[PDB]
Structures are given as C-alpha cells and as structure tokens.
C-alpha cells in the first residue's frame, strides 16, 4: 500500500493520490470529500463500511455496512448514488461512528 494503515486520513485527496480504494481509513470529513470527488469524476460508490478508529486501529461494525450494486445504465443515477452515500455517512456520524472505508467502482 502507498498509504499507512496506522493513519486516519483527514483529506479526501489522499484517497486518490495514494490509491486507497476499499482499504484506506477515512475520517468522517474525508469520507464526505471522497464521495463528492467521486461524483465529480463520474465514479459509482459501491459501498461504505463504518467503524471506530481506536487510535490506532480500525474496527469495522458490520451493521454500518452500506452497499449499492451498480445498475447497467448508471450514469443518470450517479446523483442519487452520491446523495444516498453522503446521507448514509451523516447518519453513521449521528450513531457515533468515527472512521470509514469507501469502495468505488474504478
């Protein structure tokens, strides 16, 4: 990996620069930034896994796993995919989750 598993990245840019797809641990702020960048790039968000950052260490909570399989004609649905992904992260924040891992179709 180009990034460190012992770091909770707080910038969405790190996700793309260090190739963190499906693996990099992201702060709530960074997770939202990644979702916005994904929409700008025309990328579908397949899933978001929520958990807790133990400083250091990430513990996934399976009940926070969000998943959205990509349909065949998906381009017109990217806005909805993006909207639901962000809403999901916001809800997890209300539930006390402190770290996320995002999986993009790329």
């Amino acid at each position: 990996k180009l990034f460190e598993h012992t770091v909770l990245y707080d910038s969405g840019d790190a996700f793309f620069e260090l190739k963190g797809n499906a693996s990099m641990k992201l702060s709530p702020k960074a997770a939202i930034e990644v979702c916005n960048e994904a929409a700008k790039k025309g990328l579908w968000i397949l899933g978001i896994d929520g958990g807790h950052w133990l400083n250091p260490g990430f513990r996934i909570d399976s009940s926070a796993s969000w998943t959205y399989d990509m349909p065949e004609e998906y381009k017109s649905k990217i806005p909805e995919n993006n909207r639901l992904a962000i809403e999901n992260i916001k809800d997890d924040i209300e539930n006390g989750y402190t770290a996320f891992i995002i999986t993009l179709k790329m």
């Binding site: 990996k1 896994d49 990430f58 513990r59």
Partner: peptide
C-alpha cells in the same frame, strides 16, 4: 470472511494487507 446464513451473501472480508486489523466486535 463472514457469510449470511440465510442468503449465502458474503457480508464482510477482512483487510489482509492491514496487520493491525481489529476484528468486528460481533
């Protein structure tokens, strides 16, 4: 790997590239 007993769906796979992965509490 975690699998749903009813649907047979894989619900979670650990990150084998992270030596410090903390197992799901459930």
């Amino acid at each position: 790997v975690v699998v749903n007993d009813r649907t047979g769906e894989v619900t979670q796979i650990s990150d084998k590239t992270d030596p410090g992965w903390v197992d799901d509490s459930r």
